[PDB]
Structures are given as C-alpha cells and as structure tokens.
RNA sequence: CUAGCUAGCAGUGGCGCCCGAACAGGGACUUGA
C-alpha cells in the first residue's frame, strides 16, 4: 500500500512511436511464458488496442545460463523523460565502518517490481510483443532513487522504534548490525521482516550473515576486520592493453587500502597507447615496480574498523620523486587505510604538495568520518611558519606535531629581502625573435657577455642567460632583471618542476649561499638595462 | 498572504552538489529541521524535483547553530524580478554618520507563507556521513533566508510596521538590503544604543527576538600611498620606488622620473648612497602631493559589476582594493590562524561596499579552491553570501603598500 | 535507429580515449610609455 510519486513528462512531449524489432521463433514462447508468469502474479496490465505508443523488446540469456529471459531498453525514453535528481553519487568505504558485534544483511529479489507506479505514468509502459508494467520497470533512470526513498521512509518508523541501531543501506542490500547477543538480534530481525511484509517484501532465514566476509564490490568484510578481495596477477611476459586494464584496475582497487603501491610508471606507460592489442615491452622500471608491488602483496593484511570514542591519527611516509603517501591509524600500526597523491602547475615545491595532500586527506576524513585528526608531519615548525608567513598566499592547517622519520621536508635554499654589501650588481636581460629564435643574451658587471641561442623565447632566453651568469658568478650576488615571469617563478622557491632548465637553475642556485633579486622596468635606461638591450638587439631589432 | 508569482527567466534551476559536512553540524541541522517542519515551514519530499541547493551550518554572541542557503546562483538567475519590478533606493548620508548598527530579522521571514510553484526551485538537502543514508531532502514552504526577493516583497508590511517610530526620529535613516538591516545615527553612542533598544522593543511587540555589533563610518578614508622620507637614499630603494611609481602611473597621470632617471644613467652598486637634487626632490614632492589627493575622473555605476581584490603583506597585515574597471579604484584602506582574519576582513569590506553603494561585489582570493570551500565555514558569522573566485597574484600589486 | 541479408539494452566501480565548458600565456585590429 505504499504511496507512489507523481511523475510527468518533459515539456510538451509524449511516448515515442516505434516499431519493435523482429526477433527469433524459439525465445518467443520461452519469453511469452515469462511474460504470462509476471502477469499472473498481479504486476502487469495488458491493454494494447488503446495506447498509441510502443517500446522495444529483447530476449537475453545472461550469466547463470538457464533460459532466454526478457529485457527492455529505455534509451529512447530516458532522455525524453523529465529530469530527476540523482541521489546517490558516492559510495561508502570500509575504513569508515564501526564495530557491530551482531552483523547481518538483507536483500530482496525483484524488489524493483515490488513497488507500484503512478497510473498516469504507467501509460508509458507500452511493452508490445501488449503489456503495461503496473510496477517499476528495469533499466529505468530514476527507479533506484524511488527505491531508496521508499526504503528510507519505510525504515523511518523502525528507526524510531530502535534509534540506537545503525543501518547501512545500498541498491538492494540492507547491511545492518548491532552490539547485542544473537537472540535479541534475531528478534529485531523478525520484527523488521514483519514490518516489511506489512508492505510485501521477502526475507529468508538461511542467508549469509556469519559465513562472511561478504562479497561486496570485491571486498572482504570480516567480523572484527576487513580487507579487499584476495587478488592475484598474471605471470606472463607479454602485456596487452586488455591485460593492462585488468592488472591496473586490480592494483588500483588494492592501492586504496594497501601501502607502498606505485603505479606511476605503468600509468606513464599508457600515455600515447591507443590500439587494442599493444604488446608493450615492460621497461625495467615497470618490471621492478611490479615486482615490488607483488612482494608487498605476497603477504595479506586486514584493515581495521572505526571507533567513535577513541580519536584517530594521520601520518605520512614520503617515498621521493615528488610522490607522497599517507597512513591513517587510531593506534600504532593499526592502519585504517592509505592512498596516493602525486599530481603536479608546471613549477611546484615540497611544502605545496604536502599542503595539497594533507587538505585532500582532511576532506576525505570529513566525508568519511566527519572530522580531522592531529597530523604527524616529517617537518619542523619554523620551516612551515616561515613559509606561510613569507609566502604570497594564506595556508592554514589544524593541530599537528613533528616526526623524526627520515626522509624529511625542507627548503634547500632561501632568499633575502634586503641587498648585501660586498656582492656584485648584474644588469642582465635577454630577448629573441619570433621567426629566427636565435636570441642573444648574457650579463654585465659593475665585463659583459653575449651568447646566441636556438629555438627559444624571451622568457627562456632570459632564463638561460641568468643560468649561464650564475654558472660563472661567485657566492654573493645582487641581480636585477625585467621579466616578472622568472622572478615570480623563483619567488615560489621550487625544487622540482617539469622543464629541466629550471631544475639546473635550482641546482646551480643551491651551491650559492646568498643571493638577492628584484624587478625593474625595461627600455628606461637604468644602469646597464639599456646597455644590455642594445647589445642583445644587435641584428635582431632592425 | 497573496504570494506573488515567481517566474525564472525563460535558464533552468540549479542542481549544485553539497560539499562534505560533520556530524557535529548534522545533529544541529536535524534538530532544527525537526522544529522547522513541525511549524509548517518545510516538508519532506522525494526525487520528484531534480533541483538541489547547498546547505551548511554556522556558529558571535551565542553558541547556537543557525543556517542559511547559497542562493547565489538562484539570485543571479532571477535578478530581473527584484532588480527591476520592485527596486530599492540607496541613500548617502549613512556614511556621514557617527555610528551605525546591523540587525538580522530572519525570524520575520520565518512568519509568512510562500507560493507553491516556486518551492521546487528551493531544493535543499543535507548530506550523510560515509554515504550511509540517502540525501534527506526538504522543501521551503515559507520565505527563505538570503533570498533578496523575500525582503523586496516584504518591505511593504515592514515599512507599515516601522511607521510609528521613524516619524519620531526623522534624522534616522533605514536600509533593507537583505535579512540584515541598517540604521542612520549621527548622535551619541549612548543615544544610539537607547534608540536601538527602543526599536528592538518595537520589534519584540510582534515576537521578534534579536539580542561587529556596531560600527562607525566617519573613520573610513582612503589609504594614502606614501613614500619613505629618509636622509640617505641607496640604489635598491630608488629602484623599488621607481617600479612602484611606474606601476601606479596608470592612476595618476602626473608621474615622471625625468630628474630621477638621470641618476640611474650610471650603473653602479646597490649600497652606494646618492644625494637627491632639488629638482629630483621637487619632482618627488610633487608626486607625493599628487598621490595623497583623491581620484579625479572616476564615478560609480550601479548597473555594471564590481570587483573586490585582496592581497597580503605579513604579520597578519592585509590590504584591499575595489574598482569597476581596471585601475579605476573607488576605495582603499588597511586591515590588521590566517583564514579567520581573511573572513572577517572580507565581511568588513563587503559591509563597507554595501553601506557605500548598496551592492555586493565579486571577490578574488589568493588561495586554492578546495581549501577555502572547506575552511570558510569555520569562522563565518554573517548571513549574506557573495560571489567569489580564486586568482594568482604577482609581486607587483603588492607594492600598493609596504 | 549500432557493426559486416544477418547480430544488436541499461546501471554500478574501475581502466581509459575523443569533444564541449572554465583557468594562465602566445599570433592579428585600437589607445599610451
């Protein structure tokens, strides 16, 4: 007796007029009998000579080969149907589950058909062969939404009856548990079964409740622990994009829970691959990466549940190469889960990636648990405070502490906000042409230099000019330039980027203990500015 | 009640997602929505409507947990109605007053019905931690908060009820931009508070509970761009000053470095001092006297859009700039954890812009998007929500101040 | 109605590829240094 939901069609539209495909002559009886069986149960209405519409029909023999069953496609109507709200856009996670002593689960077969449909909308079920589904059909756009809404409003009174219990619902299964003995659990289960039969559902008393760990999206939901489904890997040499997809998906499902999982190499191996049977020669790096992932996978591990009373902890063990990690635990070595964050702006630093990873982990913890723990970062306070105080942005983080777990994080150099005595002034500049690209550039002392280039832009010309200048300068220096590009880039104090040019820049800068820099306009006649402009513009300006 | 028919521009309603929340906020949301539905203000719904609007929780002066909605998109789409049909004026004496006061009468909006054909465009849902439960959707059966159409339609009865006192206090001025209110007061702070309490009683007469607080516009002026006055001038300082002057020339056309550029004709070291000739000193003093003067050749347009830029210096020191067109500044100033200060600063700047022009500008914050989206709710205390974005800043506009 | 008279549906999670929409810079028209 549940109440349906009023539903209409898109602005000024109607049911699509179509002709049902011609089919075989052996499934017809085998599917006409299925149609009559669905009819006799009191779930469909057959009214053909009135409805001037039509819908497609299909006969399928899917997995568990027993017979040719029926199927229907709404691809022609799903778009014509009025828009609806997609309720479930995410999924739960094993790490965010709690400690329920008496666990259970409840599924219902054909439950989709166990819900009526608005009779004004049931007219759009012209299942010719005619049959008009008196209940929700399959493959529908929003049917799961109405399903979950009905389930929620039906359990609402049950929740009011026993609010202390928690429920984890899903598409068709009802994962539920408590912290009591068996007797009371089964009493409440029978109470729920009656509360549901009040509206016509199904529930047996021989399903899988302790035989688990369950089989849910490839998980192992043990009673007092959990982990992903036991995984394997092929042991051949050739690697086709299909086997790639397979092992990549497997190791990704495993990486979200397992530590020390690297896929960057195998990911890079895919960029540019488009065919369907590419036997890729596994580079030595990818080979050793797979070997290490195997070694880590050669021994199993069981995740831990969550405890609301006791807090949690966050920690990281970086591996290098700009890649990061993170571990979540409530007690030493009781790792809940882990992951990976190694996305690179063309230029970046260590503390920037650290901040991004920690804020992403904070968002993850909030969406999972709803709060953030005290972080354990391998970097001292003075570095972070100086960074975010002298940086051109604002970055805040919750309480945390220091960790003496090498390797660590730091700034491999620093900049001075005031000139220095004894240093040397360097009026430098560099330009090029949009056609020849043979820009000349160099430096000037308070001795000048000029060096042509090849296939470079004014930005890159000035970059290489300051590079070659630093290659010959000493320790202390007070340089000036005009390109705000390179200045602003260096102000970020990066130690890694994509272009190897800036990498050599920072490499040479490391050795230089002291350095100062600033910005000035161009074409104004400031000391050596016009001098270098004239010297480099030789043969390229006119 | 005669619900005015609301009709969106012949553009569909929004269906924005909902960022994650915390149980400490979900409990407050549930316990307040229970009473909200008990009092016929809202009702439970299903997926019949595709729309959805953000929702969140907040926490000065109390420990309660109020709420509001992000009608930014809704307002940007339904502008025409309240912008043209029933507009509102904007006085100018309020800024010439001594002190002011800001109120909030959302409860008044919570005491009126609302049309039914427009509620579907008010879809607001709460999240579920770890996706354990589907979205518990609801609908606004009454006038919501933050929607500037509700005040636009309620102003009639509002003024009809305000009639008694304003005749006795003609010097006072009132503005109704949103759920919040304002007052004109050019008298003693004690008298200001006495009249504020009188108006609070006039409101309580109909059951309106409403216990920073005040503010003063007289102190607000422009931030004079000032240069250093030293007895010994090195090179680096002159270079920084020349860069600043060249970057600011877009504001004051009367800026030149003729007498200064000559001193730069000699490429020397940085620590060496150079004397400032009378001609150079004369031009420097002229430029200084020109800077302190206000802007000449600008105005304000209520039809166009507004921009609210922001920067940072250090030690919790911040700046801010407002303008419609690039380099056409209408106001400057100064204002001095790192996100709390930013939130209160943007609040202060928007309040200033509203009391000056009666409109909320667009912002430009130097921070990533996810960090702000996550941490802006922590220290927020107002009930109005403006637009915003995120931008990268070079170390040039920073030279507007030290 | 998708593939060469014949076989042909959707959802979930992932692996991806193409396009559209946003962000920062480069080449042509118009103003100033």
XYZ file of N, CA and C in Angstrom, chain B residues 106-261:
468
model
N 15.667 37.363 10.228
C 15.251 36.141 9.559
C 14.002 35.528 10.160
N 13.830 35.658 11.477
C 12.612 35.167 12.111
C 11.376 35.820 11.504
N 11.474 37.104 11.150
C 10.355 37.773 10.495
C 10.023 37.107 9.166
N 11.049 36.732 8.399
C 10.811 35.999 7.161
C 10.235 34.618 7.439
N 10.527 34.056 8.612
C 10.012 32.751 9.008
C 8.584 32.814 9.549
N 7.856 33.906 9.306
C 6.485 34.051 9.780
C 5.543 34.411 8.639
N 5.828 33.921 7.434
C 4.984 34.201 6.269
C 4.960 32.985 5.364
N 3.800 32.710 4.740
C 3.746 31.603 3.775
C 4.466 31.934 2.477
N 4.388 31.032 1.501
C 5.065 31.229 0.228
C 4.337 30.435 -0.847
N 4.454 30.904 -2.087
C 3.854 30.211 -3.215
C 4.353 28.770 -3.277
N 3.612 27.936 -4.005
C 3.957 26.530 -4.170
C 4.672 26.237 -5.481
N 4.392 27.001 -6.538
C 5.013 26.745 -7.831
C 6.502 27.067 -7.837
N 6.987 27.824 -6.852
C 8.387 28.216 -6.789
C 9.189 27.431 -5.760
N 8.532 26.660 -4.892
C 9.259 25.914 -3.869
C 10.191 24.887 -4.496
N 9.774 24.278 -5.609
C 10.613 23.293 -6.281
C 11.989 23.847 -6.619
N 12.107 25.162 -6.807
C 13.387 25.808 -7.058
C 14.136 26.138 -5.771
N 13.698 25.587 -4.638
C 14.335 25.809 -3.345
C 14.817 24.494 -2.740
N 15.093 23.507 -3.588
C 15.529 22.202 -3.111
C 16.809 22.334 -2.298
N 16.734 21.963 -1.022
C 17.880 21.992 -0.124
C 17.947 20.665 0.619
N 19.114 20.028 0.581
C 19.303 18.702 1.147
C 20.471 18.722 2.124
N 20.478 17.739 3.018
C 21.561 17.567 3.981
C 22.340 16.313 3.601
N 23.631 16.242 3.889
C 24.428 15.077 3.497
C 24.277 13.943 4.505
N 24.981 12.846 4.228
C 25.010 11.685 5.110
C 26.448 11.206 5.207
N 26.980 11.171 6.428
C 28.379 10.811 6.620
C 28.623 9.413 6.076
N 29.692 9.267 5.293
C 30.082 7.990 4.700
C 29.013 7.435 3.765
N 28.098 8.283 3.299
C 27.029 7.881 2.387
C 26.180 6.749 2.957
N 26.090 6.655 4.287
C 25.309 5.587 4.900
C 23.831 5.702 4.556
N 23.330 6.922 4.389
C 21.921 7.168 4.132
C 21.768 8.089 2.931
N 20.737 7.889 2.114
C 20.486 8.826 1.014
C 20.191 10.224 1.532
N 20.260 11.187 0.616
C 20.015 12.573 0.961
C 18.630 12.806 1.529
N 18.565 13.354 2.740
C 17.289 13.661 3.391
C 16.864 15.027 2.860
N 16.095 15.013 1.776
C 15.707 16.242 1.103
C 14.543 16.912 1.827
N 14.393 18.209 1.573
C 13.326 19.004 2.162
C 12.913 20.073 1.159
N 11.946 20.897 1.556
C 11.454 21.964 0.699
C 11.044 23.146 1.564
N 11.272 24.350 1.048
C 10.940 25.573 1.768
C 9.523 26.047 1.463
N 8.615 25.806 2.404
C 7.224 26.209 2.254
C 6.971 27.642 2.703
N 8.016 28.382 3.069
C 7.905 29.750 3.549
C 9.046 30.565 2.951
N 9.095 31.841 3.311
C 10.136 32.722 2.792
C 11.495 32.281 3.324
N 12.480 32.014 2.454
C 13.791 31.571 2.946
C 14.696 32.729 3.335
N 15.878 32.412 3.852
C 16.871 33.410 4.218
C 17.918 33.534 3.120
N 18.461 34.741 2.974
C 19.438 35.023 1.947
C 18.861 35.356 0.590
N 17.611 34.988 0.320
C 16.953 35.318 -0.939
C 16.477 36.763 -0.860
N 17.135 37.646 -1.605
C 16.828 39.075 -1.564
C 15.502 39.425 -2.234
N 14.712 38.454 -2.684
C 13.377 38.735 -3.173
C 12.380 38.796 -2.034
N 12.599 37.958 -1.021
C 11.768 37.990 0.181
C 11.718 39.370 0.819
N 12.842 40.041 1.092
C 12.745 41.430 1.571
C 12.123 42.360 0.547
N 12.418 42.155 -0.739
C 11.845 43.010 -1.773
C 10.325 42.988 -1.741
N 9.731 41.862 -1.353
C 8.281 41.732 -1.297
C 7.738 42.071 0.087
N 8.541 41.877 1.135
C 8.082 42.129 2.495
C 8.219 43.591 2.903
N 9.022 44.373 2.175
C 9.250 45.768 2.536
C 7.951 46.520 2.786
N 6.871 46.147 2.103
C 5.593 46.821 2.296
C 5.156 46.733 3.754
N 4.904 45.510 4.227
C 4.494 45.326 5.616
C 5.581 45.777 6.581
N 6.850 45.623 6.201
C 7.933 46.065 7.073
C 7.822 47.558 7.358
N 7.680 48.369 6.307
C 7.538 49.808 6.495
C 6.226 50.144 7.190
N 5.152 49.419 6.864
C 3.879 49.663 7.535
C 3.994 49.455 9.038
N 4.838 48.515 9.466
C 5.029 48.290 10.894
C 6.044 49.273 11.473
N 7.020 49.706 10.673
C 8.020 50.654 11.152
C 7.467 52.068 11.277
N 6.326 52.352 10.643
C 5.720 53.690 10.673
C 5.833 54.414 12.011
N 5.525 53.803 13.160
C 5.401 54.607 14.391
C 6.659 55.370 14.775
N 7.817 54.708 14.802
C 8.997 55.325 15.400
C 9.697 56.281 14.442
N 9.745 55.953 13.148
C 10.535 56.762 12.225
C 10.020 58.193 12.144
N 8.714 58.400 12.328
C 8.187 59.761 12.343
C 8.725 60.539 13.537
N 8.943 59.854 14.661
C 9.519 60.483 15.842
C 11.029 60.659 15.736
N 11.679 59.975 14.797
C 13.126 60.075 14.597
C 13.397 60.266 13.112
N 13.042 61.433 12.568
C 13.240 61.646 11.124
C 14.701 61.638 10.710
N 15.596 62.134 11.568
C 17.012 62.168 11.221
C 17.556 60.775 10.930
N 16.962 59.741 11.530
C 17.436 58.380 11.319
C 17.053 57.909 9.920
N 17.927 57.100 9.322
C 17.703 56.519 8.006
C 17.800 55.006 8.132
N 17.067 54.309 7.266
C 16.993 52.855 7.303
C 17.229 52.317 5.900
N 17.855 51.145 5.841
C 18.112 50.443 4.595
C 17.820 48.968 4.819
N 17.169 48.335 3.846
C 16.852 46.911 3.898
C 17.446 46.256 2.655
N 18.713 45.855 2.752
C 19.364 45.169 1.642
C 19.020 43.684 1.632
N 19.082 43.043 2.791
C 18.821 41.615 2.920
C 18.218 41.388 4.303
N 18.236 40.138 4.766
C 17.756 39.809 6.103
C 18.314 40.781 7.135
N 19.525 41.279 6.903
C 20.113 42.268 7.789
C 19.537 43.649 7.499
N 19.665 44.534 8.480
C 19.113 45.877 8.409
C 20.210 46.862 8.796
N 19.953 48.150 8.573
C 20.901 49.195 8.930
C 20.141 50.379 9.514
N 20.893 51.330 10.071
C 20.303 52.490 10.727
C 21.227 53.687 10.551
N 20.621 54.870 10.444
C 21.354 56.114 10.404
C 21.323 56.788 11.760
N 22.508 57.102 12.283
C 22.622 57.648 13.635
C 23.825 58.583 13.676
N 23.558 59.880 13.804
C 24.589 60.902 13.955
C 24.531 61.524 15.347
N 24.298 60.693 16.362
C 24.157 61.162 17.734
C 25.128 60.432 18.653
N 24.975 60.624 19.962
C 25.855 59.970 20.919
C 25.675 58.458 20.861
N 26.754 57.731 21.162
C 26.685 56.272 21.161
C 25.674 55.788 22.192
N 25.576 56.488 23.322
C 24.562 56.137 24.304
C 23.158 56.306 23.757
N 22.894 57.451 23.127
C 21.601 57.657 22.486
C 21.388 56.656 21.358
N 22.450 56.345 20.611
C 22.354 55.320 19.579
C 21.839 54.012 20.163
N 22.452 53.558 21.258
C 22.041 52.298 21.865
C 20.641 52.389 22.459
N 20.269 53.545 23.010
C 18.920 53.696 23.549
C 17.879 53.554 22.445
N 18.101 54.217 21.308
C 17.162 54.091 20.198
C 17.191 52.691 19.600
N 18.353 52.033 19.609
C 18.420 50.653 19.140
C 17.570 49.754 20.026
N 17.629 49.964 21.342
C 16.796 49.183 22.252
C 15.321 49.508 22.057
N 15.002 50.776 21.797
C 13.617 51.144 21.519
C 13.094 50.415 20.287
N 13.892 50.375 19.219
C 13.487 49.643 18.024
C 13.420 48.143 18.284
N 14.305 47.622 19.136
C 14.241 46.209 19.489
C 12.937 45.889 20.205
N 12.474 46.791 21.072
C 11.182 46.588 21.720
C 10.041 46.715 20.716
N 10.134 47.688 19.805
C 9.135 47.807 18.749
C 9.041 46.527 17.929
N 10.162 45.827 17.758
C 10.153 44.553 17.046
C 9.585 43.438 17.916
N 10.031 43.360 19.174
C 9.513 42.350 20.091
C 8.003 42.449 20.236
N 7.438 43.637 20.007
C 5.988 43.791 20.057
C 5.268 42.748 19.212
N 5.927 42.210 18.181
C 5.351 41.176 17.329
C 6.093 39.848 17.459
N 6.904 39.690 18.502
C 7.638 38.456 18.709
C 8.839 38.318 17.796
N 9.783 39.250 17.901
C 10.999 39.253 17.087
C 12.196 39.295 18.030
N 12.823 38.142 18.252
C 13.975 38.044 19.138
C 15.251 38.316 18.352
N 16.035 39.289 18.817
C 17.270 39.666 18.143
C 18.238 40.313 19.128
N 18.829 39.538 20.048
C 19.798 40.071 21.011
C 21.168 40.323 20.390
N 31.437 44.522 13.753
C 30.754 43.658 14.699
C 29.336 44.110 14.985
N 29.020 44.311 16.260
C 27.687 44.762 16.644
C 27.391 46.098 15.969
N 28.160 47.116 16.342
C 28.016 48.452 15.780
C 29.246 48.767 14.930
N 29.286 49.982 14.394
C 30.375 50.390 13.515
C 30.297 51.899 13.326
N 31.380 52.465 12.789
C 31.486 53.907 12.593
C 32.070 54.203 11.215
N 31.357 54.941 10.353
C 31.881 55.198 9.005
C 32.799 56.411 8.932
N 32.702 57.303 9.920
C 33.465 58.548 9.873
C 34.961 58.286 9.757
N 35.453 57.239 10.426
C 36.884 56.961 10.420
C 37.375 56.437 9.076
N 36.474 55.978 8.211
C 36.888 55.375 6.951
C 37.364 56.442 5.973
N 38.561 56.240 5.429
C 39.116 57.101 4.395
C 39.942 56.228 3.458
N 40.564 56.855 2.463
C 41.421 56.122 1.544
C 42.788 55.897 2.184
N 43.467 54.847 1.733
C 44.813 54.551 2.201
C 45.811 55.376 1.397
N 46.369 56.448 1.963
C 47.280 57.299 1.182
C 48.567 56.557 0.856
N 48.836 56.391 -0.436
C 50.075 55.765 -0.879
C 51.215 56.727 -0.570
N 51.998 56.412 0.457
C 53.043 57.297 0.951
C 54.399 56.668 0.672
N 55.368 57.519 0.364
C 56.737 57.116 0.099
C 57.622 57.419 1.302
N 58.759 56.740 1.429
C 59.642 56.996 2.570
C 60.364 58.326 2.446
N 60.630 58.931 3.603
C 61.344 60.204 3.693
C 62.596 59.972 4.532
N 63.713 59.710 3.865
C 64.978 59.406 4.516
C 65.992 60.511 4.244
N 67.107 60.442 4.969
C 68.230 61.347 4.759
C 69.338 60.722 3.922
N 69.305 59.406 3.721
C 70.271 58.709 2.884
C 69.518 57.710 2.020
N 69.690 57.817 0.705
C 68.953 57.001 -0.253
C 69.935 56.148 -1.039
N 69.772 54.830 -0.954
C 70.586 53.889 -1.703
C 69.910 53.572 -3.035
N 70.551 52.708 -3.819
C 70.046 52.402 -5.155
C 68.787 51.546 -5.067
N 68.886 50.385 -4.417
C 67.777 49.439 -4.340
C 66.470 50.127 -3.962
N 66.529 51.038 -2.988
C 65.330 51.773 -2.597
C 64.797 52.602 -3.757
N 65.690 53.265 -4.495
C 65.255 54.084 -5.621
C 64.656 53.212 -6.715
N 65.206 52.014 -6.914
C 64.663 51.106 -7.919
C 63.266 50.639 -7.529
N 63.088 50.259 -6.262
C 61.761 49.876 -5.789
C 60.774 51.027 -5.949
N 61.199 52.245 -5.607
C 60.310 53.396 -5.718
C 59.966 53.691 -7.172
N 60.934 53.535 -8.077
C 60.675 53.775 -9.491
C 59.705 52.738 -10.035
N 59.873 51.475 -9.640
C 58.918 50.458 -10.047
C 57.520 50.753 -9.540
N 57.417 51.140 -8.267
C 56.122 51.499 -7.695
C 55.487 52.653 -8.463
N 56.276 53.690 -8.754
C 55.744 54.855 -9.452
C 55.309 54.500 -10.868
N 56.090 53.670 -11.561
C 55.720 53.267 -12.912
C 54.441 52.439 -12.901
N 54.291 51.563 -11.905
C 53.087 50.745 -11.827
C 51.871 51.574 -11.432
N 52.075 52.647 -10.667
C 50.972 53.499 -10.243
C 50.632 54.591 -11.248
N 51.529 54.873 -12.199
C 51.262 55.910 -13.191
C 49.913 55.719 -13.870
N 49.427 54.479 -13.940
C 48.114 54.223 -14.517
C 46.990 54.878 -13.724
N 47.274 55.381 -12.522
C 46.272 56.043 -11.695
C 46.437 57.550 -11.826
N 47.626 58.049 -11.486
C 47.905 59.476 -11.525
C 48.736 59.793 -12.759
N 48.172 60.430 -13.790
C 48.983 60.758 -14.974
C 50.172 61.651 -14.668
N 50.117 62.440 -13.598
C 51.204 63.336 -13.263
C 52.324 62.652 -12.507
N 52.975 61.682 -13.147
C 54.081 60.943 -12.550
C 55.187 60.836 -13.589
N 56.371 61.348 -13.256
C 57.508 61.308 -14.163
C 58.780 61.113 -13.353
N 59.795 60.554 -14.012
C 61.063 60.240 -13.362
C 62.208 60.877 -14.139
N 61.933 62.007 -14.793
C 62.963 62.691 -15.567
C 64.182 62.998 -14.703
N 63.974 63.726 -13.604
C 65.082 64.068 -12.721
C 65.652 62.846 -12.011
N 64.894 61.754 -11.935
C 65.358 60.539 -11.277
C 66.093 59.618 -12.244
N 65.565 59.459 -13.460
C 66.202 58.586 -14.439
C 67.650 58.992 -14.686
